[PDB]
Amino acid sequence: EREKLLRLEEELHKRVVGQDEAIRAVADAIRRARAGLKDPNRPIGSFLFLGPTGVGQTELAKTLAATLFDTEEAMIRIDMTEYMEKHAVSRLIGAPPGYVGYEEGGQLTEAVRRRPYSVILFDEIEKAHPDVFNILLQILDDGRLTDSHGRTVDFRNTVIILTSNLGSPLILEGLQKGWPYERIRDEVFKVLQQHFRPEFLNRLDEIVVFRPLTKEQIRQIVEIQLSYLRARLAEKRISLELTEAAKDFLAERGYDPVFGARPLRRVIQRELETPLAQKILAGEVKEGDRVQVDVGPAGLVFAVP
Ligand SMILES: CNc1ccccc1C(=O)O[C@H]1C[C@H](n2cnc3c(N)ncnc32)O[C@@H]1COP(=O)(O)OP(=O)(O)O
């Protein structure tokens, strides 16, 4: 779809809040590939996602997968902290013929076989063993791999996203000192040239920087999640309102500067979804009811006028 590409930013922003520069960079690289300006035998895009934990990296990879390939299922997550022990290559691409687990294939290769159109997410690439890192280079160069079975795995329709906890303490200092996004991107690059040779970094479409989320941005994520929960309740014809306090209650608990907004899912589950379920099962919240949710001395409270 043409205008899907032409309006990819607002499309990715349907699910991902803030990180405009990150989304612009991503959207621009997909457009160059789709216009036919880059190598047809390389992947669609290769990115290095930098910044703090839980600020929209996975959610961007998911949204990109849903937007371009119809579903979030078209995202493959390979955590490199599990592939650092040298015997890891056979886990990624398969055990050799005659060895236990040859018929199983490899974690990455089998996933990209049954989903040639997929977004691939590599977590903490610095941790990966040099031999695992060489396989990553082969994807970036050849646009293809050969697994242990000898079957060629195509990567030309994939979008490669690499993440790194490396360089994030610098970008935090960058925003503290008030540097523009431009020079933050340029300063982190020098930190990266100390852990990766420019051989690798030049193959990347963009070096992408994610910021910490502001108070306003956290609210917008809460709203988006309440929007999905609202759809589920609408099937029972149940309306749900939250007071500003109730929205701030969830925002305060669902975000911390260490894990980002990762706690939010189970905060919403523990503080809103589990209590609401109880009220529904008891009979206090019925089909056709409009619920107002407010803050009390113990937690969120539910009332039906
Ligand atoms: C089924 N999933 C959920 C259900 C309820 C609440 C959150 C989630 C969930 O996956 O929530 C995810 C998405 C959400 N989030 C963080 N930053 C942003 C942002 N800038 N824009 C939009 N969302 C963001 O916070 C959670 C963690 O973020 P992440 O992007 O998965 O982590 P990381 O940035 O480390 O990859």
The CATH number of whichever domain residue 48 belongs to comes to 3.40.50.300
- Which residues on neighbouring strands pair with residue 50, listed in sequence order? 164, 209
Q: Hey, CA dihedral for 201, 207, 173, 84, is it positive or negative?
A: negative
What is d(CA 21, CA 42) in angstroms, rounded to the nearest whole number? Answer: 24
| End-to-end CA gap in the chain | 46
Identify the residues whose C-beta falls under 6 Å from ligand 1. Answer: 16-19, 53-59, 213, 221, 225, 260-262, 264-265, 268
Distance 87 CA to ligand 1 centre (A): 32
Rg (CA), the chain: 22
Burial class (CB in 10 A: 0-12, 13-18, 19+), 126: middle
| Shared domain check, 59 and 15 | yes
| Shared domain check, 165 and 23 | yes
CATH number of the domain to which 226 belongs: 1.10.8.60
How far is the CA of 15 from the CAs of 10, 102, 183, in angstroms? Answer: 9, 39, 27
Which residues have CB under 8 Å from 62's CB, separation 6+? 15, 72, 75, 119
Helix (H) / strand (E) containing 175: helix 168-177
> Backbone phi, then psi, for 57, in 5-degree steps?
-80, -55
| Shared domain check, 55 and 32 | yes
| Shared domain check, 106 and 30 | yes
| Shared domain check, 173 and 128 | yes
Query: What is the resolution of the experimental data for this entry, in Å?
Result: 2.8
25: how many CB neighbours lie within 10 A of its CB? 20
| Shared domain check, 75 and 110 | yes
Residue range(s) defining the domain that contains residue 65? 1-212
DSSP 8-state symbol, 299: S
Q: Which residue has the tokens 């089998």?
A: 110
| Shared domain check, 258 and 113 | no
Residue nearest to atom 25 of ligand 1 (CA): 261
| Shared domain check, 72 and 5 | yes
Q: Give the total residue count for the chain.
A: 305
Which residues have CB under 8 Å from 167's CB, separation 6+? 50, 188, 191, 192
Identify the CA nearest to 219 among candidates 193, 186, 243, 183: 243
| Shared domain check, 220 and 191 | no
| Shared domain check, 225 and 200 | no
Q: Hey, CA dihedral for 57, 61, 67, 73, is it positive or negative?
A: negative
Torsion, CA 276, CA 278, CA 280, CA 284, rounded to 10: -100
Distance 54 CA to ligand 1 centre (A): 6
What is d(CA 267, CA 64) in angstroms, rounded to the nearest whole number? Answer: 25
Residue nearest to atom 26 of ligand 1 (CA): 262
Burial class (CB in 10 A: 0-12, 13-18, 19+), 179: middle
Residue nearest to atom 1 of ligand 1 (CA): 265
- The DSSP annotation for 219-244 comes to HHHHHHHHHHHHHHHHTTT-EEEE-H
Ligand 1, from 13, 262, 272: best to mutate by most atoms within 8 Å of Cβ? 262
Are the beta carbons of 208 and 50 closer than 8 angstroms?
yes
The experimental method, as deposited, was X-ray
Measured in whole angstroms, the distance separating CA 7 from the mean position of its chain's CA atoms is 20
| Shared domain check, 252 and 155 | no
Distance 262 CA to ligand 1 centre (A): 6
Q: Which residue has the tokens 């991107």?
A: 185
Number of structural domains the chain divides into = 2
| Shared domain check, 206 and 221 | no
